Amino acid sequence: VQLVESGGGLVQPGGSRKLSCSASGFAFSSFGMHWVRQAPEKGLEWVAYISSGSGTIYYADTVKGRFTISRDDPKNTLFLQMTSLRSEDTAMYYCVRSIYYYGSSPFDFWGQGTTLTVSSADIVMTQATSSVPVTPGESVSISCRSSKSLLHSNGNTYLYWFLQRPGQSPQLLIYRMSNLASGVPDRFSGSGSGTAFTLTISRLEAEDVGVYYCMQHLEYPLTFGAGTKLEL
Amino acid sequence: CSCSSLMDKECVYFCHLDIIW
Amino acid sequence: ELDQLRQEAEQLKNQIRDARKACADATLSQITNNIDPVGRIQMRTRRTLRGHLAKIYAMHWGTDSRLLVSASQDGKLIIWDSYTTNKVHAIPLRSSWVMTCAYAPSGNYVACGGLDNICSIYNLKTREGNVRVSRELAGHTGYLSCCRFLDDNQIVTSSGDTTCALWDIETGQQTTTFTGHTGDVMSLSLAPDTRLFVSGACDASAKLWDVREGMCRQTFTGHESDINAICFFPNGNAFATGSDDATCRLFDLRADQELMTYSHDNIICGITSVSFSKSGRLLLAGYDDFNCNVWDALKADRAGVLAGHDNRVSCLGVTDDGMAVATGSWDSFLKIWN
Amino acid sequence: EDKAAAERSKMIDKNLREDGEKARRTLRLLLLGADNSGKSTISGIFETKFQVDKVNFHMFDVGGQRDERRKWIQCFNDVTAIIFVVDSSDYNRLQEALNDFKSIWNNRWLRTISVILFLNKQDLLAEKVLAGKSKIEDYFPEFARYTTPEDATPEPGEDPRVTRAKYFIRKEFVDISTASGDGRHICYPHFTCDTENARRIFNDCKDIILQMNLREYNL
Amino acid sequence: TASIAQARKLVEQLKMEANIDRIKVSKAAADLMAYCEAHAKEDPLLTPVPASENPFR
Amino acid sequence: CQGPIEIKETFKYINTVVSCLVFVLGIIGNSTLLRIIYKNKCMRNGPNILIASLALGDLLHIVIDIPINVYKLLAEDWPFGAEMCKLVPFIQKASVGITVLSLCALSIDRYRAVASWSRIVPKWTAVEIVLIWVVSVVLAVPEAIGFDIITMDYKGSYLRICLLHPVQKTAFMQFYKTAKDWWLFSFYFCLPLAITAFFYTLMTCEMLRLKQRREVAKTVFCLVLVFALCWLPLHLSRILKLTLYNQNDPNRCELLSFLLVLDYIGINMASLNSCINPIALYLVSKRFKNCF
Description:
The structure holds six protein chains of six kinds. Chain B is built from one helix and no strands. By secondary structure, chain B is an all-alpha fold. The longest helix of chain B has 9 residues, at 9-17. By secondary structure, chain C is mainly beta. Chain C has one domain: Methylamine Dehydrogenase, Chain H (7 Propeller), CATH 2.130.10. The longest helix of chain C has 21 residues, at 3-23. Chain C is globular. The N and C termini of chain C lie far apart (60 Å). Chain E has one domain: Transducin (heterotrimeric G protein), gamma chain (G Protein Gi Gamma 2, Irregular). Helices cover 54% and strands 0% of the residues of chain E. Chain E has helices spanning 2-18, 25-38. At the C-E interface, α1, α2 and β17 of C face α1 and α2 of E. Chain B: It comes from Homo sapiens (Human). Chain B: This is Endothelin-1.
């Protein structure tokens, strides 16, 4: 499983270019793809999403009907057409891979990304704090507030947690309540009461430092909360 | 069944005794 | 000499028959005459699981009451979602001919087998996403008939080689072999504590085994014809098995005897599947006709009729929490009951 | 995410139908017979990949099974036809071959499914009756009272003793097939030795398919 | 030969099976009835759950 | 002229005994098919609903026409009102409109499997049956509007005659009566008997190019042939009207008498066609013979 994104760099504003991501190590046709943008020293933001077989294609409400994302399973490559470029479109674009079924792990693998630099009535995710220094060996807990309750009548919420270590793409930590992701230690735990959602760490280690991100999946806009940074 | 709109006594009597179709 | 061996064997059979007759002080029908009859129970089809391309042969529930595994002769192991009916996985079997499928209690593995003499196990939690076969077991030279999971590493399989095999996933080789049966063992069930497993064959006999000692412990031959399916009681010291003679019999490990016989004059076809409820109050058996019958385990009374299948039933399953019942037939439909 | 989960289900069932539609254009076949008969002339289950007249035929040959045949056949209720191979050359195993024949003819599951017969090694039968060391066909003395039928024209340049023997075997084959089952299914007695087997099996498969289709139309 | 070995295995298996302990069927029946009546309230099949708590409807 | 036919009493007697016999034979005949097609679940194939629809059409066929055709022999008053006076011609046209195309529909589906190398309620069949049950009403709704009750005094009587009104009301209905004989012939005989003969022969050619195949070829050929000769006398009677009817010659007294003879024997025999198919399936199908 490895994602490589090519293209970007300095571009004249108002121009057009093609962004391509190469997928390997998994069956491309059976996976859904998401695009997320990370502007320099700001928070995460959803861009576009394409499903398996391109049956449904969704875009961010801010750029709805503007960009174009396409996939080609036989050639094993994902494309994102940059129709127009503004000052808001300079960001650290990451490619995300996922499937949606019972027990699935959405947003579990994130690509390294490529750098592109230019020359309402939706749920909003907010965090009480923005940064805190935590000494190694102790327990650190954070909390998040959602505009609307994420407790769907099915019986589970849709709050996701991520760890973006400095110099690499974010990795999934927790995708649901009372369960853990893959390839992550068991010290991480999370719980929610429907209004205030909290994430707890049993014991913070040296590799656990970074910035924590939260994303809800109820309502496709998929807003990303403000990052909480840790210092040692 | 009636070939015309006149008295057509024979034709109207026949269609009055005719099968219903 | 040689005839002395047969004489001693006959003496042993007579001794066990006399011991069983002496231990049969009374029958529990007299005891259960006091208890309240369960009465008529009617269940509706809360979900119709369309999508199968051919006749379904076997199925196995998961640890949770939401995941479903079904196997059909078309060669497609497809995992379904009980609550929302959407397909979860579709594993194209290498061999079209399959007869059994088991879901691991941990949920990370699934297995299938049939006339291919191969016990193919698949990993459902691969990082690549698609389902791939972890390994195939070819030790059995006969047709595979049933498989049950002890854990993520051990699986108990019954095949047409008149033998039951316990496998190790890590090594892929047989751990213990049970060869006390004379007919081809077909149906295999584990105790809730995963300490003993019981099975039946075409010799009209059901034998209880222990997975580690690799030897037979108990035998039951109260049937009059071929038996098809057999399952463990919820508590763990009892079991009941169906048969082709349109009769069901329940046995107790401590008693080492038959207790009831579930038979009706109306029924003319044999049993193809059998499973208890969560508490053992209701005994559910799949029959060779186009419907399914539900029996009371203690009173041996007729409770209800489960129609809705246009072709013979071939499989039956009950959730761990007892919330739902899944019956599969050759009509390419999984019917979920409650 | 109901929408994403439903699309995955909509993806799976479409592939099931797409891969299941191609499973109907290919017709399945079942091969059964004694070990003496040359079934392979025409692991576990052996499947042969061959086709004729734009339709694929899947012949399923079993192996490893010792003697049990009354319930492993349950899986083969769907296959439209069954191929039976009889080693008529040897008379010693002829009696046990017909006991197997009566076993599957009267199966509680094979009651609406026809069978196709292939008397392999018909040549070896020919030189056996031509020469000595062969008598009564190791049968009941009722063969003496039998008479050759003139209804069917033998292949030209035939031995009248050879034709008497083979037609007698077919006559009892017809008798054993018509004893039970009524008009639910019809046994197809055919001879084999032979590059015409592929053509012969296709017409037999077309006949039962044609006969089954008219049976479902109740005409 | 194989027949004598098979007969010896059969007689040893019969002896081992006969050497096991057996209890009266009345006590086993009473235990089974007690277990059935103890878990009766936890069996949805015996007592159907209301549609509010039914995961299917 | 001494009356149009002054109804010979013998003619009424033979019709009453022969129509009642057809009625009971028709009633038990198709209803048994409906009972078998509904009580049993296995007999719910694609052709089975098509066969049941033909029997259902044959059910509604003999229910309406037979009681009122045989009544007019006893007396002609139409004591059913003007609202229903348009109901029988509309429904009875729709009564046989389903049956005439059901035979065509059965021939369409029978040719499919005979010409196919594979076989075993189909979506196409479900649409196919739905289309016929409405297209018959749509093609018979011109009969609903146009029929009326007219008073006429024949030498002194309170006779309420019934026929298609010569005023035609709408100009479209004027075209309807002018081609009423030919439209009935074209859409009940010309179009149906052509496709059911071309396709069945194609099925026979494919099936043949063997005793069962030859025998099944005769029963379908007999079924189409008996259908042609059963509805011919009723349709031929109107054919003679539109061809050689003349007012100048004073032969209308005998001409109407002869055609009225052909009208009642044709409709009684046409009702027999509605009841020979369920008895036809009994003698050709082993699945229905043992299910009786």
